[PDB]
């Protein structure tokens, strides 16, 4: 006899060496899995009764685990299979005539022992602390430090795919899904690879929200990881000009006023953080000598050694500028208009 299916070797009359396939969960019992299923069904045919056996195989303890019924060719498991010790089996199945003159046939039978997807994935870190500049575009990549040079790396593994030791370099991609439980509208995460990354879906304003706290969760097709907390800091850029409440001030002074006295108290606002939002005031021109401004306070006073003459008018050009780097610094101007009355 000869095994089904027969597939001619091109340009001859031999069947192709045929190899049956089966696969089995580890640590599960004869009762549970029997009968073991074989693609394609093991069958042989004459062209009077047929006998199915196992000649040989590797490892040599194949007979500990596998018995083959000799008329049907049905395959049984005799013992649970611990994948730690046993991973595959390559057998040579035989089929012959129950005559004294057999015309026997051979096929292979590969048996794959499987790690079943009964463990939930984990992240190699207890939490994540990422950074991005409010100035970054859609598509840009969360970073691991204030330097914004390295991207934030998120590694999630599954022990049903490879048992990596707690220090260990991984080598197999567990083909997992990672999902954010919040801010799904703002951030996304690379959907493939051992290492995953974050990127913006939508730009972010430090002056709105400067921190994002959410968790990510892994999924292997069946179970999920514990959630792991990710935490994203939005770093300041100088996107806010020191603006004044008004564009013009009308201010009257009197002749009996003396040096040091208050004229007007200006106060600009710069929503930025740090020194990007720190304000410095100067009078660019118009003082004519008779007024000065507190660089820090925005309070204008009457200059030292100076007399208010009842005629005079002035137009002070006053500037507020933040203390960013000169290349990135901003400013905004208002005019204070003054006239001297008598007491
Ligand atoms: Ca798993
Ligand atoms: Ca902003
Ligand atoms: Ca600013
Ligand atoms: Ca800002
Ligand atoms: Na497993």
Swiss-Prot record:
Tissue/organ expression: Expressed in brain, lung, kidney, spleen and testis. Found also in the inner and outer synaptic layers, and the nerve fiber layer in adult and fetal retinas. Found in the supporting cells, outer sulcus cells and spiral ganglion of fetal cochlea. Expressed in cytotoxic tumor-derived T- and NK-cell lines as well as biopsies of nasal NK/T-cell lymphomas. Not detected in normal or in vitro activated peripheral blood cells, CD4 or CD8 lymphocytes or NK cells. Isoform 3 is expressed in brain, heart, cerebellum and kidney.
Domain Cadherin: 16-123, 124-244, 245-343
Subcellular location field: Cell membrane
Residues of this chain annotated as glycosylated in UniProt: 147, 294
Subunit structure: Antiparallel heterodimer with CDH23. Found in a complex with TMIE and LHFPL5. Interacts with LHFPL5/TMHS; this interaction is required for efficient localization to hair bundles. Interacts with MYO7A. Interacts with USH1G; this interaction may recruit USH1G to the plasma membrane. Interacts with TOMT. Isoforms CD1 and CD3 interact with TMC1 (via N-terminus) and TMC2 (via N-terminus).
Domain notes: Cadherin repeats 1 and 2 mediate calcium-dependent heterophilic interaction with CDH23. Three calcium ions are usually bound at the interface of each cadherin domain and rigidify the connections, imparting a strong curvature to the full-length ectodomain.
Function text: Calcium-dependent cell-adhesion protein. Essential for maintenance of normal retinal and cochlear function.
Medical condition linked: Usher syndrome 1F: USH is a genetically heterogeneous condition characterized by the association of retinitis pigmentosa with sensorineural deafness. Age at onset and differences in auditory and vestibular function distinguish Usher syndrome type 1 (USH1), Usher syndrome type 2 (USH2) and Usher syndrome type 3 (USH3). USH1 is characterized by profound congenital sensorineural deafness, absent vestibular function and prepubertal onset of progressive retinitis pigmentosa leading to blindness. Usher syndrome 1D/F: A digenic recessive form of Usher syndrome, a genetically heterogeneous condition characterized by the association of retinitis pigmentosa with sensorineural deafness. Age at onset and differences in auditory and vestibular function distinguish Usher syndrome type 1 (USH1), Usher syndrome type 2 (USH2) and Usher syndrome type 3 (USH3). USH1 is characterized by profound congenital sensorineural deafness, absent vestibular function and prepubertal onset of progressive retinitis pigmentosa leading to blindness.
Protein's name according to its UniProt entry: Protocadherin-15
Source organism phylogeny: Eukaryota, Metazoa, Chordata, Craniata, Vertebrata
The encoding gene: PCDH15
Full-protein residues shown: 263 to 608 of 1955
């Amino acid at each position: 006899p000869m095994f089904l299916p027969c597939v001619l070797v091109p340009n001859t009359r031999d069947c192709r060496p045929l190899t049956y396939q089966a696969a089995i969960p580890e640590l599960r019992t004869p009762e549970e899995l029997n009968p073991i299923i074989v693609t394609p069904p093991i069958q042989a045919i004459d062209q009077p009764g047929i006998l199915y056996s196992i000649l040989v195989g590797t490892p040599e303890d194949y007979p500990r685990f596998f018995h083959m019924h000799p008329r049907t060719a049905e395959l049984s498991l005799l013992e649970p299979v611990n994948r730690d010790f046993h991973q595959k089996f390559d057998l040579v199945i035989k089929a012959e005539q129950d005559n004294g003159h057999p015309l026997p046939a051979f096929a292979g039978l590969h048996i794959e022992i499987l790690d079943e997807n009964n463990q939930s994935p984990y992240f190699t870190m207890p939490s994540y602390q990422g950074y991005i500049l409010e100035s970054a575009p859609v598509g840009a990549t969360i970073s691991d430090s204030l330097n914004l040079t390295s991207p934030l790396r998120i590694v999630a593994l599954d022990k049903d795919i490879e048992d990596v030791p707690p220090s260990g370099v991984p080598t197999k991609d567990p083909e997992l899904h990672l999902f954010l439980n919040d801010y799904t509208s703002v951030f996304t995460v690379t959907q493939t690879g051992i290492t995953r990354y974050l990127t913006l879906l939508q730009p972010v304003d430090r002056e709105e929200q400067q921190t994002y706290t959410f968790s990510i969760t892994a999924f292997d097709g069946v179970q999920e990881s514990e959630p792991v907390i990710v935490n994203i800091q939005v770093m300041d850029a100088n996107d806010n000009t020191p603006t004044f409440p008004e564009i013009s001030y009308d201010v009257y002074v009197y002749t009996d006023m003396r040096p040091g006295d208050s004229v007007i108290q200006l106060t600009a606002v710069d929503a930025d953080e740090g020194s990007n939002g720190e304000i410095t005031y100067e009078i660019l021109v118009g003082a004519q000598g008779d007024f000065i401004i507190n660089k820090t306070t925005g309070l204008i006073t009457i200059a030292p050694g100076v007399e208010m003459i009842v005629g005079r008018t002035y137009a002070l050009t006053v500037q507020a500028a933040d203390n960013a780097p000169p290349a990135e610094r901003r400013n905004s101007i208002c005019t204070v208009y003054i006239e001297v009355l008598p007491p």
